[PDB]
Amino acid sequence: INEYRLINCNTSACTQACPKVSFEPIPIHYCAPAGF
Amino acid sequence: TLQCTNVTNNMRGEMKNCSFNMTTELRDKKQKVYSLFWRLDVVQINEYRLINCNTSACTQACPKVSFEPIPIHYCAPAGFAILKCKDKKFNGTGPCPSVSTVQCTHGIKPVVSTQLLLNGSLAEEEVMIRSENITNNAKNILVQFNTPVQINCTRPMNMTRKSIRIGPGQAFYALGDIIGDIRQAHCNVSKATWNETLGKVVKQLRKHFGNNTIIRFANSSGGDLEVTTHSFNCGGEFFYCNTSGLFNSTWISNNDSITLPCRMKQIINMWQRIGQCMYAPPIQGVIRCVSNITGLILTRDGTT
Amino acid sequence: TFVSVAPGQTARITCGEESLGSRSVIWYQQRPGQAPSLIIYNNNDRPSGIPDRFSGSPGSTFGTTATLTITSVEAGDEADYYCHIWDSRRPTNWVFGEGTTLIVLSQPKAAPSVTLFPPSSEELQANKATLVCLISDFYPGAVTVAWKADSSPVKAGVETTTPSKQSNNKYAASSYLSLTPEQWKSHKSYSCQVTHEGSTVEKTVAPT
Amino acid sequence: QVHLQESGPGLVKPSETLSLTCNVSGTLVRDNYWSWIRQPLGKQPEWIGYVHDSGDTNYNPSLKSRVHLSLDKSKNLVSLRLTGVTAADSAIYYCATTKHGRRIYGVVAFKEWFTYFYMDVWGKGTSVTVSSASTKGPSVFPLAPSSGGTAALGCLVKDYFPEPVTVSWNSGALTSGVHTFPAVLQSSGLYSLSSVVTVPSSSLGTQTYICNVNHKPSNTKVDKRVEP
Ligand SMILES: *[C@@H]1O[C@H](CO)[C@@H](O[C@@H]2O[C@H](CO)[C@@H](O[C@@H]3O[C@H](CO[C@H]4O[C@H](CO[C@H]5O[C@H](CO)[C@@H](O)[C@H](O)[C@@H]5O)[C@@H](O)[C@H](O[C@H]5O[C@H](CO)[C@@H](O)[C@H](O)[C@@H]5O[C@H]5O[C@H](CO)[C@@H](O)[C@H](O)[C@@H]5O)[C@@H]4O)[C@@H](O)[C@H](O[C@H]4O[C@H](CO)[C@@H](O)[C@H](O)[C@@H]4O[C@H]4O[C@H](CO)[C@@H](O)[C@H](O)[C@@H]4O[C@H]4O[C@H](CO)[C@@H](O)[C@H](O)[C@@H]4O)[C@@H]3O)[C@H](O)[C@H]2NC(C)=O)[C@H](O)[C@H]1NC(C)=O
Ligand SMILES: *[C@@H]1O[C@H](CO)[C@@H](O[C@@H]2O[C@H](CO)[C@@H](O[C@@H]3O[C@H](CO[C@H]4O[C@H](CO)[C@@H](O)[C@H](O)[C@@H]4O)[C@@H](O)[C@H](O[C@H]4O[C@H](CO)[C@@H](O)[C@H](O)[C@@H]4O[C@H]4O[C@H](CO)[C@@H](O)[C@H](O)[C@@H]4O)[C@@H]3O)[C@H](O)[C@H]2NC(C)=O)[C@H](O)[C@H]1NC(C)=O
Ligand SMILES: *[C@@H]1O[C@H](CO)[C@@H](O[C@@H]2O[C@H](CO)[C@@H](O[C@@H]3O[C@H](CO[C@H]4O[C@H](CO)[C@@H](O)[C@H](O)[C@@H]4O)[C@@H](O)[C@H](O[C@H]4O[C@H](CO)[C@@H](O)[C@H](O)[C@@H]4O)[C@@H]3O)[C@H](O)[C@H]2NC(C)=O)[C@H](O)[C@H]1NC(C)=O
Ligand SMILES: *[C@@H]1O[C@H](CO)[C@@H](O[C@@H]2O[C@H](CO)[C@@H](O[C@@H]3O[C@H](CO)[C@@H](O)[C@H](O)[C@@H]3O)[C@H](O)[C@H]2NC(C)=O)[C@H](O)[C@H]1NC(C)=O
Ligand SMILES: *[C@@H]1O[C@H](CO)[C@@H](O[C@@H]2O[C@H](CO)[C@@H](O)[C@H](O)[C@H]2NC(C)=O)[C@H](O)[C@H]1NC(C)=O
Ligand SMILES: *[C@@H]1O[C@H](CO)[C@@H](O[C@@H]2O[C@H](CO)[C@@H](O)[C@H](O)[C@H]2NC(C)=O)[C@H](O)[C@H]1NC(C)=O
Ligand SMILES: *[C@@H]1O[C@H](CO)[C@@H](O[C@@H]2O[C@H](CO)[C@@H](O)[C@H](O)[C@H]2NC(C)=O)[C@H](O)[C@H]1NC(C)=O
Ligand SMILES: *[C@@H]1O[C@H](CO)[C@@H](O[C@@H]2O[C@H](CO)[C@@H](O)[C@H](O)[C@H]2NC(C)=O)[C@H](O)[C@H]1NC(C)=O
Ligand SMILES: *[C@@H]1O[C@H](CO)[C@@H](O[C@@H]2O[C@H](CO)[C@@H](O)[C@H](O)[C@H]2NC(C)=O)[C@H](O)[C@H]1NC(C)=O
Ligand SMILES: *[C@@H]1O[C@H](CO)[C@@H](O[C@@H]2O[C@H](CO)[C@@H](O)[C@H](O)[C@H]2NC(C)=O)[C@H](O)[C@H]1NC(C)=O
Ligand SMILES: *[C@@H]1O[C@H](CO)[C@@H](O[C@@H]2O[C@H](CO)[C@@H](O)[C@H](O)[C@H]2NC(C)=O)[C@H](O)[C@H]1NC(C)=O
Ligand SMILES: *[C@@H]1O[C@H](CO)[C@@H](O[C@@H]2O[C@H](CO)[C@@H](O)[C@H](O)[C@H]2NC(C)=O)[C@H](O)[C@H]1NC(C)=O
Ligand SMILES: *[C@@H]1O[C@H](CO)[C@@H](O[C@@H]2O[C@H](CO)[C@@H](O)[C@H](O)[C@H]2NC(C)=O)[C@H](O)[C@H]1NC(C)=O
Ligand SMILES: *[C@@H]1O[C@H](CO)[C@@H](O[C@@H]2O[C@H](CO)[C@@H](O)[C@H](O)[C@H]2NC(C)=O)[C@H](O)[C@H]1NC(C)=O
Ligand SMILES: *[C@@H]1O[C@H](CO)[C@@H](O)[C@H](O)[C@H]1NC(C)=O
Ligand SMILES: *[C@@H]1O[C@H](CO)[C@@H](O)[C@H](O)[C@H]1NC(C)=O
Ligand SMILES: *[C@@H]1O[C@H](CO)[C@@H](O)[C@H](O)[C@H]1NC(C)=O
Ligand SMILES: *[C@@H]1O[C@H](CO)[C@@H](O)[C@H](O)[C@H]1NC(C)=O
C-alpha cells in the first residue's frame, strides 16, 4: 500500500484456525431416518 | 467526540454536520470523515457525542433486511384449536353468540406504532370502543374505525449515504450532503375524513359517559418522547410526529389537509427496554408511504 | 467572461456558482455606456417588452449553474450580462455574479473615420497649444496612434484615450498632443497617423 | 410612464457624508419599493439596500453601519446617505423601482419560502467620484471647420474635474451626426474630451452652431459659438 499489509485486511475480518483440530479427511457415512 | 455544526441554511437548527476521528481498517492511522445526525441522535458535553453513548452499547441495523410489516398468521399444534368470534358488535369481553373455529388467524402485520393504529383490521358497522374498565381512568381505551382514515408521509430530503469503512470487514453507513431543499418530514391527514371519523367516535363515547355530556380532546399530558408522539416506521426511518392538531376538539351534546410535524431519529430503543439501541441506516431519495388509520389509543383524565 | 455566437445561432451564458437549492435567478442586460435593464426574472419568466428568444435554465435543477439561453442571436444583443443567484442555502447575495459578455461575429470590418483638428484661436492667446485627433466608426477597437513633425516622430506629449463602443460596432478613440504657441509656428506640417488592422490612415495640418 | 433621476454632488472628500437624492416622476414613493445600486468601473453591480414605507427597509451586510436611506413622501423623492466614504465608494449610483416575489418551494405553511426582489425600471445614474482634490471649472475653446460636399465642426472642453460633462448643440437641436468622445486622464489629473458634428458644407447661413457646455460639480455653463 503506497511497507505492506495482510491480503485480507481490505476485505474480511479474520480468524485463526485452532492448532488442535486436524483438517484430515476422515470417512463420512451419510444415512436417512425411519420411513426412508 | 463529535465536533458538530448547523446545517447550511439561512432560523431553527434541526440537524448537525459532524466530524470525528475514526478507526480505519488497519489498527494504525485514523480517519477524518464526516456524518450528519439529527438533533435527537446526539447530545453535547461541556463538541458533542451520540445520544446513546452514555447508556447502551450500540449496534447498526443491517442494510439488507427490511422493516416492512408482512402478514403473520399465528397457529396452534395438534390437540389444540383457536376460536374466532364472528359477530359485528363485540367489546372483546363476554359471551359470543356466533363462535367459529379456525386453525390459523388472519394476516396480522406487526405494526409497531403509538397513538395512531396503522394498517389494522377495520371494525364492522358502528366503530368499536373497547376498554378494560371504563370507570377507571387508568386503562387505555382501544378504538377501532369502520372507515379508514388516509394518511400520507414524505421524507422529502434527497439525502446521501456515506459508507465509511471501520474495517476490517465492518462498515458504518452515515449521512452525506443533502441534495435539494432543507425540509422536514410531514404526515398529511385529509381535513374532511378526520372530522367525520372524530364525530363517529364521540357518539359512541356518549353511549358510555352520559347522553348529554361534553367530550373534549387535548394532546399528550407529557413525560417520555414515545408516549407524546406518533412513533412509526415506513421506508426504514423512524418518524416521531406531533398530534396536537388531531386532538384539539370540544364536542357538545349535539377542504384541505391536516399536516403534522414529524421529527426523525436513527438510534432507537424499541419496546420500552429491549434489543439495545439500533442505528437504522439512512435512506436515500424521497421516502413516501400511505397508511391506514384503523384505530386510536386514548387515555382519560382524572360534568365533562 | 465572454461568449461568441454567429448571427442567427444560439448563445448560452454562464453566471454564478452552482445551484445547491431551488433558485430564482435574475438576469440583467447592461448595454455599453447605459444602465442595466431587466431581462428574465424567476428563472424563465419574461416581463413585458422582452421577446421569447431569451430563456433561462429552470431554477429547479440541483447541481447546475444559472444558464441564459439566447436564440436567434443578433448584432443588438452585443452587450454585458449579469445574474442574481437567489439560493435557499445561500444567504442573500448582494454582489451580482461576475458578468458575461456577448460578442456577435461577422460584424465584420470597419475603416477608421479619423479626424484631425488644429488648435483654436482662443487657446493660442492663452499661450497653450493642443492637437486633437478623433477616431470613430472603427471595428475592432485596437488602434495605435503615431504623430509626425513633418517626417520626424514625436515622442512625448501624446495623450491617447482608450476605445469604447457605443451601442453599435462604432468605437471611439481620441488622441491628443500638447504643444507651445512657439512650437506650432515652427514645423511645416504635423501629421496624425492611425494604424488600424494592417492599414494606416494619415492626415496632416498646416499653419496660416 | 415611469421616469427616474439621480442627482448628487458628483465629488465628495474622503470620510465625508455622501448625500444623494433620487427624484421620482410617474408614481408615488409610498406604493412601491426602492433600491440603489452602485457599480465601480469594470466590476459587477453591487447592491446597497432597499427602502419602502411602513418601516420596511434593509441594508447590505457589507455597508451596514454607514448607509441610511429615506423616502420623502411630501417631495416624492428618494434620499441616500453614505457616511465615511473612501475611494472604494466611487462608482455610479443608480436608483430603480423594485418589485417583489415569493418563491414557494416547500409546503408554504412551514415558512418554506423566501422573498426575492428584482429591479425593473432603472434610472440614468449619477457619477460620484471620491477624491481629496478641489473642483476645477473647464475652459471651452471652439474647433474651426475645415473641409466632398460635407464638413466637420466641433467644440472642446479642456481641463476639468471631476466627471462627467454633458455637451449639447444648439440647446438640444442637433442629434444627427453628433459623436461625443470619452475623455482622457492626463498626468496632471484632469480629463479632456471632444465632440464633433458632421453638417453639410452648405452652411454659409450662418447656420449658427452653438455647443452648450455644462459641468455640475463646478456649476459652469459656457455657451460657445463656432465660426469659420
Ligand atoms: C400535504 O399537504 C400539503 C398542503 O397541501 C402539501 O404541501 C404542498 O406541497 C406542494 C408540493 O409538495 C407545494 O407545491 C409547490 O407550489 C409552489 C407554488 O405553487 C402555487 O402557486 C403557483 C403560482 O402561484 C403564484 O403565481 C400566481 C400567478 O401565476 C399568483 O396568482 C399567486 O398569488 C402566486 O404568486 C400555482 O401555479 C400553484 O397551483 C398549482 O396547483 C393547482 C392545484 O392546487 C393546479 O391547479 C395548478 O395548475 C398548479 O399546478 C401546476 O400547474 C402546472 C402544470 O399543470 C405547473 O406548470 C405549475 O407550476 C403548477 O405546479 C400553487 O397554487 C410551486 O411553485 C412548486 O413547484 C415549483 O417548485 C418545485 C421545487 O422548488 C419545482 O420542482 C417545480 O418545477 C416548480 O418550479 C417552477 O416554478 C418556480 C416559481 O414559479 C420557477 O421559478 C421554477 O423555475 C419553475 O418554473 C419554471 O420551470 C418549469 C419546469 O418545467 C416550467 O414548466 C415553468 O414554466 C418555468 O419555466 C411546488 O409544486 C405546495 O406549495 C405545498 N403547500 C400548499 C399549501 O399547497 C404537501 O405536498 C402534502 N404532502 C403529501 C405527501 O402529499
Ligand atoms: C401500511 O401499508 C401500506 C401498504 O403496504 C404501506 O405502504 C408501503 O410503504 C412502503 C414505504 O415504507 C413502500 O415500500 C417501498 O416502496 C418503494 C416504491 O416501490 C415502487 O416500485 C415497485 C416495483 O417493485 C412498484 O410496484 C411500486 O408501485 C412503486 O412504484 C420501493 O422503492 C421500495 O423498495 C425497497 O424496499 C423493499 C422492501 O423494503 C426492497 O425489497 C427493495 O429491494 C427496495 O430496497 C432497496 O432498493 C434499491 C435496490 O434496487 C436500493 O437502492 C434502496 O436503497 C433499497 O435498499 C419499497 O418497496 C411499499 O411499497 C408500500 N406498500 C405498497 C403495497 O406499495 C405502509 O408503509 C404501511 N404503514 C406502515 C406504518 O407501515
Ligand atoms: C459538512 O461539512 C463538511 C466539512 O468538512 C463539508 O465537506 C466539504 O464541503 C466543501 C464544499 O464547499 C468541500 O470544499 C470543496 O472542495 C472541492 C474539492 O477540491 C479538490 O480539487 C482541487 C483541484 O482544484 C484539488 O487540488 C483538491 O485536493 C481537491 O481534490 C473544491 O473543488 C471546492 O472549490 C470550489 O468552491 C470554492 C468555494 O469558495 C470556490 O471558490 C471554487 O471556485 C470551487 O468552485 C470546495 O473548496 C470540502 O472539500 C468538503 N470537505 C470534505 C472533507 O469532504 C460538507 O459538504 C458539509 N455538508 C453539508 C450538507 O453542508
Ligand atoms: C435569508 O435569511 C434572511 C434572514 O436571516 C432573510 O432576510 C429577512 O427577510 C424577511 C422578509 O423576507 C424580513 O422580514 C421582514 O420584516 C419587516 C419588519 O421590519 C416586515 O415588515 C416584512 O414584511 C418582513 O416580514 C427580515 O427582517 C429579514 N431578516 C434579516 C436579518 O435581514 C432573507 O430574505 C433570506 N434570503 C434567502 C435567499 O434565503
Ligand atoms: C483488496 O486488495 C486486493 C489486492 O490488492 C484487491 O484485489 C485486486 O483486484 C483487482 C481488481 O481490479 C485485480 O486487478 C488485482 O489483480 C487484485 N489483486 C490481487 C493481488 O489479486 C481487491 O480488489 C481489494 N478489495 C477492495 C479494495 O475492496
Ligand atoms: C482527531 O485526532 C487528531 C489527532 O491526530 C486531533 O488533533 C489534535 O488535537 C489536539 C487538541 O484536540 C491538539 O492539541 C493537537 O495538536 C492535534 N494534533 C495532533 C495530536 O497531531 C483532532 O483534534 C481530532 N479531531 C477531533 C477530535 O474532532
Ligand atoms: C444520558 O444522557 C441523556 C441526555 O443528555 C440524559 O437524559 C436526560 O435526563 C434528564 C434527567 O434529569 C432529563 O431532565 C433530560 O431532559 C434528559 N435529556 C434528554 C436530551 O432527554 C440521561 O440521563 C443520561 N444518562 C446517564 C447520565 O446515565
Ligand atoms: C362488554 O360488553 C358486555 C356485553 O356484551 C357487557 O356485559 C354487561 O356488563 C354489565 C355490567 O357492566 C352487566 O350488568 C350486564 O349484565 C352485562 N351483559 C352482558 C350481555 O354481558 C360488559 O359490561 C362490557 N364491558 C365493557 C368494559 O364495556
Ligand atoms: C386501507 O383501507 C382500504 C379501504 O378502502 C383498503 O382497501 C380495501 O381492502 C380490502 C381488503 O384488504 C378490499 O376488500 C377492499 O375492496 C379495498 N377497498 C377498496 C376501495 O378497494 C386497503 O387495503 C387498506 N390498506 C392497508 C390496510 O394497508
Ligand atoms: C437525488 O440525487 C441523486 C444524485 O445523488 C439523483 O440521482 C440522479 O438521477 C438522475 C435521474 O433520476 C440521473 O440522471 C443522475 O445520473 C443521478 N445521479 C447520480 C449521482 O446517480 C436523484 O434523481 C435525486 N432524487 C430525485 C427524486 O430526483
Ligand atoms: C395521499 O396521497 C394520495 C396519492 O399519493 C392521494 O390520492 C390522490 O388524490 C388525488 C386527488 O386529491 C387524485 O387525483 C389521485 O389520483 C390520487 N392518487 C391515488 C394513487 O389514488 C391522496 O389524496 C393523499 N391524501 C392526503 C390526505 O394527503
Ligand atoms: C400540547 O399543546 C400545548 C398547546 O395547546 C403545548 O403548550 C405549549 O408548551 C410550550 C412548551 O414547550 C410553551 O412554551 C407554550 O407556552 C405552551 N402553550 C400553551 C398555550 O400553553 C404543549 O407543549 C403541547 N405538548 C405536547 C407534548 O405536545
Ligand atoms: C406540537 O405542537 C404544539 C402546537 O401546535 C407546539 O406548541 C407550541 O410551542 C411553542 C413553544 O416553542 C409555542 O411558542 C407555540 O405557541 C405552541 N403552539 C401552540 C399552538 O400553542 C409544540 O411545540 C409542538 N411540539 C411538541 C413536542 O409538543
Ligand atoms: C385548536 O384549534 C383552535 C381553532 O379551532 C386554534 O385557535 C387559533 O386561535 C388563534 C387566535 O386565538 C387564531 O388566530 C387561529 O386562526 C386559530 N386556529 C385555527 C386553526 O383556526 C388553537 O390554536 C388550536 N390549538 C392548538 C394547540 O393547535
Ligand atoms: C445550531 O443552530 C442553533 C439554532 O438555534 C444555534 O443556536 C447553534 O449555535 C447552532 N450550532 C452551531 C454549532 O453553530
Ligand atoms: C373499575 O374501576 C372502579 C373504580 O376505579 C372499581 O371500583 C371497580 O372495581 C373496577 N372494576 C370493575 C367495575 O369491574
Ligand atoms: C367539523 O369540525 C368543526 C371544527 O373545526 C366543527 O365545528 C364542525 O361541527 C364539524 N363538522 C361536522 C359536520 O361535524
Ligand atoms: C340517549 O337519548 C336517546 C334519544 O335522545 C335515547 O334513545 C337513549 O336511550 C338515551 N340513552 C340513555 C338514556 O342512556
Residue C145, SS3 per DSSP: strand
Q: How far apart are CA C179 and CA C163, in angstroms?
A: 24
Q: Do B183 and D109 touch (CB under 8 A)?
A: no
Of the three residues C39, C71, C104, the one that is the final residue of a domain is: C104
Place of cell 367489546: B91
Q: Which residues of A touch B167 (CB under 8 A)?
A: 9-10, 13
- Residue spans of the domains in chain D: they are 1-132, 133-228
Q: Which of B180, B202, B101, B196 is nearest to B148 (CA)?
A: B196
Q: How far apart are CA B86 and CA B99, in angstroms?
A: 6
Mutate-to-test residue for ligand 15 from B6, B18, B45, B49, highest number of ligand atoms within 8 A of CB = B6
Residues C207 and C109 in one domain: yes
Of the three residues C55, C77, C104, the one that is the final residue of a domain is: C104
Q: How far apart are CA C45 and CA C43, in angstroms?
A: 6
**B133 CB less than 6 Å from ligand 16?**
yes
DSSP sequence for B249-293: EEE-----EEEEEEEEESB---TTT-S---BPPP--S-EEEEEEE
Resolution of the entry in angstroms: 3.5
Exposure on the CB side of residue C111, measured as CA atoms within 13 A? 6
What is the radius of gyration, based on Cα positions, of chain D? 22
Instruction: Give the start-end residues of each E strand in C2-155.
Output: 2-5, 10-15, 26-30, 36-40, 54-56, 66-71, 80-84, 97-104, 115-117, 129-136, 144-149, 152-153
Mutate-to-test residue for ligand 3 from B16, B177, B181, highest number of ligand atoms within 8 A of CB = B177
Residues after which chain C is broken (C–N above 2.5 A) are none
Q: Are C79 and C29 in contact (CB under 8 A)?
A: yes
How many structural domains comprise chain C?
2
**H helix runs in D1-139, sequence order:** none
**Which grid coordinates belong to B270?**
424499541
Q: What is the 3-state secondary structure (H, E, C) of chain A?
A: CCCCCCCCCCCCCCCCCCCCCCCCCCCCCCCCCCCC
Q: Which ligand sits closest to the CA of B253?
A: 18
Residue type at D27 in one-letter notation: T
Nearest Cα residue in chain A from B28:
A5
Q: Are B282 and B173 in contact (CB under 8 A)?
A: yes
Of C36, C98, C115, which has the smallest distance from its Cβ to D196's Cβ? C115
Q: Are D18 and D82 in contact (CB under 8 A)?
A: yes
Q: Do C164 and D45 touch (CB under 8 A)?
A: no
Q: Are B38 and B264 in contact (CB under 8 A)?
A: yes
The sign of the dihedral angle between the CA atoms of C188, C194, C199, C201 is negative
- Domain of C16 in residue numbering reads as 1-104
Buried-exposed string B232-256: b where 16+ CB fall within 10 A, e elsewhere: bbbbbbbbbbbbeebeeeebeeeee
Interface of B with A (CB under 8 A): 25-26, 167-170
Q: Which residues of B touch C64 (CB under 8 A)?
A: none
Specify the CATH superfamily of domain D1-132. Immunoglobulins (2.60.40.10)
Residue type at B276 in one-letter notation: Q
Pairing of strands D126-130, D11-12: parallel
Q: How far apart are CA C116 and CA C206, in angstroms?
A: 11
Q: Do B184 and D110 touch (CB under 8 A)?
A: yes
Residues C179 and C93 in one domain: no
**Residue C113: Cβ-neighbour burial (10 angstroms; 0-12, 13-18, 19+):** middle
**Which grid coordinates belong to B194?**
378526520
Q: Are B249 and B217 in contact (CB under 8 A)?
A: yes
C64 in contact with chain B, both atoms CB, cutoff 8 A? no
Residues present in chain A in total: 36
Q: Are B143 and B296 in contact (CB under 8 A)?
A: yes
Place of cell 489629473: D189
Residues C19 and C31 in one domain: yes
Mutate-to-test residue for ligand 14 from B195, B198, B242, B248, highest number of ligand atoms within 8 A of CB = B248
Residue C124, SS3 per DSSP: helix
Atom 24, ligand 14: residue with shortest CA distance: B248
Residues C95 and C126 in one domain: no
Q: Which residues of B touch A2 (CB under 8 A)?
A: none
Q: What is the dihedral of CA B219, B223, B226, B227, to 10 degrees?
A: -50
Tell me how close the Cα of C69 comes to any Cα of chain D, in angstroms. 20
Q: Are B130 and B144 in contact (CB under 8 A)?
A: yes
Q: Provide the experimental method for this PDB entry.
A: X-ray
Expressed in angstroms, the distance from the first to the final Cα of chain A is 57
**Which grid coordinates belong to C66?**
444559472
Residues C147 and C207 in one domain: yes
Buried-exposed string B130-152: b where 16+ CB fall within 10 A, e elsewhere: bbeeeeeeeeebbbbbeebbbbe
Specify the CATH superfamily of domain D133-228. Immunoglobulins (2.60.40.10)
Q: Which of D207, D208, D209, D212 is nearest to D223 (CA)?
A: D212
Interface with C, mutate which of D179, D195, D223 (most C CBs under 10 A) = D179
Q: Are B151 and B291 in contact (CB under 8 A)?
A: yes
Expressed in angstroms, the distance from the first to the final Cα of chain D is 44
Chains A and B touch (3+ CB pairs under 8 A): yes
Q: Which residues contact B261 (CB under 8 A, 6 or more apart)?
A: B184, B186, B241, B242
Q: Which residues contact B229 (CB under 8 A, 6 or more apart)?
A: B114, B115, B220, B240, B241, B242, B243, B263
Pairing of strands B48-50, B42-44: antiparallel
Q: How far apart are CA B61 and CA B71, in angstroms?
A: 22
CATH at residue C193: 2.60.40.10
**Which grid coordinates belong to B72?**
403473520
Q: Are D202 and D151 in contact (CB under 8 A)?
A: no
Residues C126 and C185 in one domain: yes
**B286 CB less than 6 Å from ligand 7?**
no
CA D106 to ligand 13 center in whole angstroms: 21
Q: How far apart are CA D45 and CA B20, in angstroms?
A: 42
CA B228 to ligand 16 center in whole angstroms: 27
CA–chain centroid gap for C119, Å, is 29
Residues C120 and C69 in one domain: no
**B55 CB less than 6 Å from ligand 7?**
yes
**Which grid coordinates belong to C114?**
479619423
**Which grid coordinates belong to D95?**
436608483
**Could you say which residues from 240 to 259 on chain B have a Cβ atom under 8 Å away from some Cβ of chain D?**
259
Q: Would you call the peptide bond into C47 cis, given omega within 30 degrees of 0 as the criterion?
A: no
Q: Are B20 and B33 in contact (CB under 8 A)?
A: yes
Q: Which ligand sits closest to the CA of B37?
A: 3
DSSP 8-state code for residue D89 = G
Q: How far apart are CA B219 and CA B245, in angstroms?
A: 8
Q: How far apart are CA C110 and CA C196, in angstroms?
A: 10
Q: Are B267 and B50 in contact (CB under 8 A)?
A: yes
Q: How far apart are CA B220 and CA B301, in angstroms?
A: 11
Residues C39 and C84 in one domain: yes
Residue D65, SS3 per DSSP: helix
Q: How far apart are CA C66 and CA C24, in angstroms?
A: 9
Tell me how close the Cα of A8 comes to any Cα of chain B, in angstroms. 8
CA D21 to ligand 5 center in whole angstroms: 73
Q: Which of B90, B86, B87 is nearest to B128 (CA)?
A: B90
- B289 forms bridges with which residues in the sheet? B153
Q: Which of C151, C152, C134 is nearest to C143 (CA)?
A: C134
Residues after which chain A is broken (C–N above 2.5 A) are 2
Q: Would you call the peptide bond into C140 cis, given omega within 30 degrees of 0 as the criterion?
A: yes
Q: How far apart are CA B86 and CA B80, in angstroms?
A: 19
Q: Do A9 and B167 touch (CB under 8 A)?
A: yes
Q: Which residues of B touch C85 (CB under 8 A)?
A: none
Q: Which of B246, B257, B226, B228 is nearest to B154 (CA)?
A: B257
Interface with D, mutate which of C19, C22, C24 (most D CBs under 10 A) = C24
- Phi and psi angles of residue B39, each rounded to the nearest 5 degrees, phi first: -65, -30
Q: Which residues of C touch B180 (CB under 8 A)?
A: 21-22, 62
Q: Are B173 and B163 in contact (CB under 8 A)?
A: yes
Of the three residues C89, C104, C119, the one that is the final residue of a domain is: C104
Q: Do B182 and C62 touch (CB under 8 A)?
A: no
DSSP sequence for B110-163: ----SSEEES-----SSPEEEES-SS-TTS-EEEE-SS-EEEEEEE--B--EEE
The set of long-range contacts for D85-90, using a CB threshold of 8 Å and a minimum separation of 24, is D85/D12, D85/D14, D85/D15, D85/D16, D85/D17, D85/D18, D85/D130, D86/D14, D86/D15, D86/D130, D87/D14, D87/D130, D87/D131, D89/D18, D89/D38, D89/D128, D89/D130, D90/D40, D90/D128, D90/D129, D90/D130, D90/D131
Chains A and D touch (3+ CB pairs under 8 A): no
